[PDB]
């Protein structure tokens, strides 16, 4: 039974670190992890370092591929100070830790030798404004494929990967739970662009950003564990983000553990689980590398696409 994938346990995967240096301190790591995340420097060494190696081995090889098409076309040469940007997709369910995984990865690749311009963009900013969502009757579908301005998103990544000087992306506010009027994240010809979002690995009747990814990550975990992380993180936010009177969810701060648990579960039941099951998980088979986490948040199993 041949397979396009090859599996690894942490032991087998850490050995592939070779002599990749760790350019991240305990403090720096901290300002990168999210509430609830258990990621430590050891996990960054045994897991994120090999990955950082594999990515660098493929950034060069991926360039030969575009070089070929350039040659074929009898095109210039591609200023070495402006090669074709390596796009990386990071996917997974809400609360599975993917935003941390992305932030940490950007940190490791930025500290690679020639100091690459490694930008990071969350699909958060490509969600339709609340007003527009209400219009489409989608206010209770945030995160589902249809609640994002997919065309704009694709326009953005195509722009960057096609060598444009700069490209803009809207910015989403978690505090206000809506797109921020007039706010934009400018990305200027990075060497690497990481795109993090729920369905970035999705495929369809049109060319999508998944078709432009040169490498993709899917952070995974048993669904039940993710719900616990979700609920738990919800309760913890009563004294962090919800505490802020400006917060759209401020009314949640005064909930009892019990009341809050009921609320979190309902949201999970009606929005996040469905989206995970119907849209996110079906895209897992296509990811270059899947990071599997045990109930403790620890990455103890990995699946790589060798084909």
Ligand X SMILES: CC(C)(CO)[C@@H](O)C(=O)NCCC(=O)O
> For binding to its own copies (CB under 8 A), which residues are involved?
2-4, 6, 16, 50, 53-54, 57-58, 60-62, 64-69, 71-74, 158-159, 161-162, 164, 203-207, 211-212, 282, 285-286, 304, 306-307
Q: Closer CB to ligand X, residue 198 or residue 289?
A: 198
Q: Closer CB to ligand X, residue 83 or residue 274?
A: 274
220 is an interface residue for ligand X by CB under 6 A: no
227 is an interface residue for ligand X by CB under 6 A: no
Q: Closer CB to ligand X, residue 124 or residue 196?
A: 124
Which of ligand X, its own copies, none lies near 71, with the C-beta cut-off 5 to 8 A by kind? Answer: its own copies
Residues 56, 57, 61: CA angle, nearest 5 degrees = 110
Which of its own copies, ligand X, none lies near 267, with the C-beta cut-off 5 to 8 A by kind? Answer: ligand X
Cβ atoms of 64 and 57 closer than 8 Å: no
Q: Closer CB to ligand X, residue 67 or residue 138?
A: 138
Q: Locate 102 and state its tokens.
A: 């992305």
Q: Which residues pair with 200 in a beta bridge?
A: none
Q: Closer CB to its own copies, residue 264 or residue 280?
A: 280
The maximal CA–CA distance of the chain, rounded, in angstroms, is 67
Which of ligand X, its own copies, none lies near 271, with the C-beta cut-off 5 to 8 A by kind? Answer: ligand X
**Binding region:** 92-99
Q: Which residues pair with 121 in a beta bridge?
A: 195
* Smallest distance from ligand X to CB 45, Å: 29
* Smallest distance from ligand X to CB 267, Å: 6
Cβ atoms of 5 and 305 closer than 8 Å: yes
Q: Please report the sign of the dihedral spanned by the C-alpha atoms of residue 92, residue 274, residue 202, residue 144.
A: negative
How many Å apart are CA 83 and CA 94, to the nearest integer? Answer: 33
Q: Locate 88 and state its tokens.
A: 């990386």
Give, as one character, the DSSP assignment of residue 127: B
Give, as one character, the DSSP assignment of residue 162: T
* Smallest distance from ligand X to CB 217, Å: 18
The 122-161 contact track toward ligand X, x by CB under 6 A, reads --x--x--------------xx------------------
* Smallest distance from its own copies to CB 289, Å: 11
Distance set, CA 263 to CA 174, 247, 248, 270, 275 (Å): 18, 17, 15, 11, 18
* Smallest distance from its own copies to CB 37, Å: 27
Q: Closer CB to ligand X, residue 5 or residue 177?
A: 177
Who's near 202: CB < 8 A, 6+ residues apart?
145, 208, 210, 279, 283
Q: Closer CB to ligand X, residue 168 or residue 271?
A: 271
Which residues within the stretch 66-95 sit at the binding site for ligand X (CB under 6 A)?
Answer: 94
* Smallest distance from ligand X to CB 288, Å: 23
Which of ligand X, its own copies, none lies near 142, with the C-beta cut-off 5 to 8 A by kind? Answer: ligand X
Distance set, CA 290 to CA 29, 163, 183 (Å): 21, 29, 33
271 is an interface residue for ligand X by CB under 6 A: yes
Cβ atoms of 196 and 213 closer than 8 Å: no
**Binding region for ATP:** 92-99
Q: Which residues pair with 195 in a beta bridge?
A: 89, 121
Give the distance from CA 92 to its chain's centroid.
Answer: 7
Cβ atoms of 35 and 237 closer than 8 Å: yes
Contact residues for ligand X (CB under 6 A)?
94, 124, 127, 142-143, 267, 271
């Amino acid at each position: 039974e041949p397979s396009p994938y090859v599996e690894f346990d942490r032991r087998q995967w850490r050995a592939l670190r070779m002599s990749t240096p760790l350019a991240l301190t305990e403090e720096e790591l901290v300002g990168l992890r999210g509430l609830g995340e258990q990621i430590d420097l050891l996990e960054v060494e045994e897991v994120y370092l090999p990955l950082a190696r594999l990515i660098h081995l493929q950034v060069a090889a991926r360039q030969r591929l575009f070089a070929a098409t350039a040659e074929f076309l009898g095109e210039p040469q591609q200023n070495p100070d402006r090669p074709v940007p390596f796009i990386i997709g990071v996917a997974g369910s809400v609360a599975v830790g993917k935003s941390t995984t992305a932030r940490v990865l950007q940190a490791l690749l930025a500290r690679w030798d020639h100091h690459p311009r490694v930008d990071l963009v969350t699909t958060d900013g490509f969600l339709y404004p609340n007003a527009e969502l209400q219009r489409r009757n989608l206010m209770h579908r945030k995160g589902f494929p249809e609640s994002y301005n997919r065309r704009a998103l694709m326009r953005f990544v195509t722009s960057v990967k096609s060598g444009s000087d700069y490209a803009c992306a809207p910015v989403y506010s978690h505090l206000h739970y809506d797109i921020i009027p007039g706010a934009e994240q400018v990305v200027r010809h990075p060497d690497i662009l990481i795109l993090e979002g729920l369905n970035v690995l999705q495929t369809g009747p049109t060319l999508m950003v998944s078709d432009l990814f040169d490498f993709s990550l899917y952070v995974d975990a048993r669904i039940e564990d993710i719900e616990q992380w979700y609920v738990s993180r919800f309760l913890a936010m009563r004294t962090t983000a919800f505490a802020d009177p400006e917060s759209h969810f401020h009314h949640y701060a005064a909930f009892s553990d019990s009341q809050a648990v009921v609320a979190a579960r309902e949201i999970w039941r009606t929005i996040n689980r469905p989206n995970l099951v119907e849209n996110i998980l079906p895209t897992r088979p296509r990811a270059t590398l899947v990071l599997r986490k045990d109930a403790d948040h620890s990455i103890n199993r990995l699946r790589l696409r060798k084909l």
